[PDB]
Design a protein around this ligand. Structure first.
Ligand SMILES: CCCCCCCCCCCCCCCCCC(=O)O[C@@H](COC(=O)CCCCCCCCCCCCCCC)COP(=O)(O)OC[C@H](O)CO
Ligand SMILES: CCCCCCCCCCCCCCCC(=O)OC[C@H](COP(=O)(O)OCCN)OC(=O)CCCCCCCCCCCCCCC
Ligand code: HEM
Lengths: 55, 431
C-alpha cells in the first residue's frame, strides 16, 4: 500500500497495474483459445460431435 | 458418304459407306429412360435384356448376325448387324421380332430368368462401378422430380414391382410409328431405301406418343454417399447445359475440350494441356479428369469429374478447377482457342469416323430423331472453324458466371465442403 498513507506512488502504481493486468488476460486468453482449438468444442446433446462438422 | 431422307408414316435414314463391309440395319425409338415414371424404372432395361436373352440363339442358328442394344436417355435402339449381302434376313428377323409376334418372347420362365439376371447385373453395377454411380446420382440430383433424373438401369426396388402388364403397356405406349426411324449404316445403297417402306412391312399400332406434363428443370441439389470402406473418392460437378438443336452446342463442346482430360499415371499426359495441369502436378492431388458436355432433347449438363487417392486434397482440387473455370470467362489466349479447336476437330473425327457400323447408326439415329437429317462432318468442321474467342467468352459468361451447380460424391468424402464454399468460389474472387 506504499506506506501508512496514500500519495502519488500508490495511485500511480494502481493505475499502472490496472493497465497491465488485462495484457495478462489477453495472453492467458490466447492460451485458452489454443487449448480450445487443440481439444475442440462440445455439444448441447452431451454426445460425440465428430460425426458431422462444418467450417 | 452421304445422307438420305424420306418418309411415309415412318422415317427411313441411310448413310452409305462402301469402304466398310459390315452392314447394320435396325430401328431406333425416341422414347427411353426419359419417358417412364419413377414407379416403372427398369422397363426399358428389361426390354433390352429380353431381346438380348433368348432369340440370340435363333439369330446365330437360322442366320448369321450379332444384335445389340443401347439406352442412354431416350434413344432405345435395337441394331442388327450383318454381312453386306445378308441385310434382308436381318430386316425380316427384326419384323418377326417386333411387329409379330412378341407373345412367344413374353413367357413366365424367360421373363423370370431375365428378371434375376437383370437384378444380379444391377446389383453388381451398384457395388463396383463408382464413377458411373456418381454420374447417375448427379443426374438424379440435378433433375429432382422430373422425367430426366431416374437412372437408365432401374432402381433396385423398382424391378420387382412389374411383371408382364407394365412391360406390354410400355410396348403399346412407346413402340409407335411416330418416333421410330430405320437406320441403314454400312455399305448398302438402295435396298434399305425401298424395303423399309412397304404396304405392311412397318411397325403396327399407329398412334402418338403421350405428352409430358413437365419438360425439364435444374436446381442445385447436393447428394453424398459417404462410406469409408472404399479406398478412393469420386466427385462430380455440373451446370446447366444446352439441348440438341441450339446455337450453343459446339461452343459448349469447345469449352469442355479446352481443359480436356488428364491421367497422372501416363507419361504422355503430364506434359500437355492447360494451366490447371501445371498447378496440379506440383502436389499429387487427382488421378483422372473428365470434362463432359452432355446434351439431351430437353436439357444438357456441362460438367466435370475426377477421382483422388488423396483424401485431404479434395478441397484444393475443387478450388483450382473452379478458379480455372472462372478464368475461362475473362481471359483466354487465342492460342488456347486454336489448340482447343484442333483438339475438338480430332475428337469429333474419331467419334464420327470409327469403323463400327453400330456406333455410326446410333449417332445417325440420335441426330435424325431431333432435327430431321444428320449434320454432315464437313459442315460441322466449318462451323467449328467459325467459332472465335468472342463467342466462347460470351457463352461462358452466360452459362457459367454465378450459376447454380449440382454436386455428387461417394467414398471418403469427409473433407469436402458442402455447398456454400464451392458455390461462392465462382464470383467472390476479384474480377
Ligand atoms: C468472430 C471470429 C472472427 C473475428 C474477426 C476476425 C479477424 C480476422 C479476419 C481474417 C480473414 C477473414 C475475413 C473474411 C475472409 C473471406 C474468405 C477468404 O478470404 O478466404 C477464402 C480465400 O479465397 C481465395 O483464396 C480467393 C479470394 C482472394 C483473391 C482476391 C483478393 C482480392 C483482394 C484481397 C485484399 C485483402 C488481402 C488479405 C486477405 C486476407 C477462402 O475461401 P475460398 O474462395 O478459398 O473457398 C474455399 C475453397 O474450397 C478452397 O480455396
Ligand atoms: C472485418 C469485417 C467484420 C468481420 C467479418 C464479418 C464477415 C465479413 C464477410 C465474410 C464473408 C466473406 O468474406 O465471403 C463471403 C462473401 C460472399 O460473396 P459471394 O460468395 O455471395 O459472391 C458474391 C460476391 N462476389 O464474399 C465476400 O464478401 C468477399 C469479401 C472479401 C473481403 C476480404 C477482406 C477485405 C479487407 C478490406 C480492407 C483491405 C485492406
Ligand atoms: C474471460 C475470457 C474468455 C474468453 C474470450 C473465452 C473464449 C472462449 C471460446 C471462444 C470458447 C469456444 C466456445 C465459445 O465460443 O464459447 C470457449 C469455450 C469455453 N470456455 Fe471460455 N472464454 C473465456 C473465459 C472462460 C472462463 C472464465 C471459463 C471458466 C469457467 C471458461 C470456460 C470455457 C469452457 C468450459 C468452454 C467450453 C465450451 C465448448 O464446449 O467448446 N471460459 N471460451
Amino acid at each position: 500500500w506504499g506506506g501508512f498513507s496514500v500519495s502519488n506512488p500508490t495511485i500511480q502504481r494502481f493505475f499502472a497495474l490496472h493497465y497491465l493486468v488485462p495484457f495478462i488476460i489477453a495472453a492467458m486468453v490466447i492460451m485458452h483459445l489454443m487449448a480450445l482449438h487443440i481439444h475442440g468444442s462440445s455439444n448441447p446433446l452431451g454426445i460425440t460431435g465428430n460425426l458431422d462438422r462444418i467450417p | 458418304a452421304e445422307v438420305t431422307q424420306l418418309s411415309n408414316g415412318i422415317v427411313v435414314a441411310t448413310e452409305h459407306n462402301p469402304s466398310a463391309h459390315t452392314a447394320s440395319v435396325g430401328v431406333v425409338f425416341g422414347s427411353g429412360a426419359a419417358n417412364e415414371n419413377p414407379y416403372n424404372n427398369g422397363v426399358s432395361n428389361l426390354w433390352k435384356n429380353i431381346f438380348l436373352s433368348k432369340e440370340n440363339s435363333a439369330v446365330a442358328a437360322k442366320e448369321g448376325l450379332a444384335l445389340s442394344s443401347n439406352i442412354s436417355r431416350d434413344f432405345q435402339s435395337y441394331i442388327v448387324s450383318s454381312l453386306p449381302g445378308s441385310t434382308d434376313k436381318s430386316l425380316d428377323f427384326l419384323n418377326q421380332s417386333f411387329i409379330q409376334q412378341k407373345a412367344n418372347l413374353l413367357s413366365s420362365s424367360n421373363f423370370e430368368a431375365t428378371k434375376k439376371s437383370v437384378l444380379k447385373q444391377v446389383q453388381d453395377f451398384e457395388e463396383n462401378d463408382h464413377p458411373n454411380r456418381v454420374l447417375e446420382h448427379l443426374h438424379s440430383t440435378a433433375f429432382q422430380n422430373t422425367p430426366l433424373s431416374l437412372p437408365t438401369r432401374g432402381t433396385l426396388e423398382s424391378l420387382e414391382n412389374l411383371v408382364v402388364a407394365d412391360l406390354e403397356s410400355f410396348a403399346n405406349n412407346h413402340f409407335l410409328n411416330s418416333n421410330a426411324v430405320v437406320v441403314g449404316t454400312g455399305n448398302i445403297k438402295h435396298e434399305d431405301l425401298v424395303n423399309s417402306i412397304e404396304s405392311k412391312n412397318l411397325s403396327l399400332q399407329t398412334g402418338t406418343k403421350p405428352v409430358l406434363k413437365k419438360k425439364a428443370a435444374f436446381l442445385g441439389s447436393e447428394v453424398r454417399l459417404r462410406d469409408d470402406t472404399l479406398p478412393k473418392a469420386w466427385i462430380s460437378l455440373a451446370v446447366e447445359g444446352e439441348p440438341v438443336n441450339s446455337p450453343n452446342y459446339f461452343v459448349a463442346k469447345l469449352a469442355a475440350q479446352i481443359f480436356g482430360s488428364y491421367n497422372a499415371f501416363e507419361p504422355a499426359s503430364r506434359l500437355q494441356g492447360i494451366k490447371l495441369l501445371d498447378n496440379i502436378q506440383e502436389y499429387q492431388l487427382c488421378d483422372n479428369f473428365n470434362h463432359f458436355s452432355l446434351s439431351y432433347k430437353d436439357s444438357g449438363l456441362w460438367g466435370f469429374s475426377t477421382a483422388t487417392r488423396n483424401v485431404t486434397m479434395i478441397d484444393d482440387l475443387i478450388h483450382f478447377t473452379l478458379k480455372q473455370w472462372n478464368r475461362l470467362t475473362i481471359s483466354v489466349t487465342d492460342t488456347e482457342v486454336e489448340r482447343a479447336k484442333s483438339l475438338l476437330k480430332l475428337q469429333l473425327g474419331q467419334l464420327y469416323e470409327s469403323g463400327n457400323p453400330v456406333n455410326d447408326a446410333n449417332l445417325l439415329g440420335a441426330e435424325v430423331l431431333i432435327k430431321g437429317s444428320k449434320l454432315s462432318l464437313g459442315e460441322a468442321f466449318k462451323k467449328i472453324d467459325a467459332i472465335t474467342v468472342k463467342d466462347v467468352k460470351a457463352w461462358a459468361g452466360k452459362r457459367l458466371w454465378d450459376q447454380d451447380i449440382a454436386i455428387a460424391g461417394t467414398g471418403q468424402i469427409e473433407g469436402l465442403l458442402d455447398y456454400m464454399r464451392i458455390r461462392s468460389d465462382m464470383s467472390m474472387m476479384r474480377w
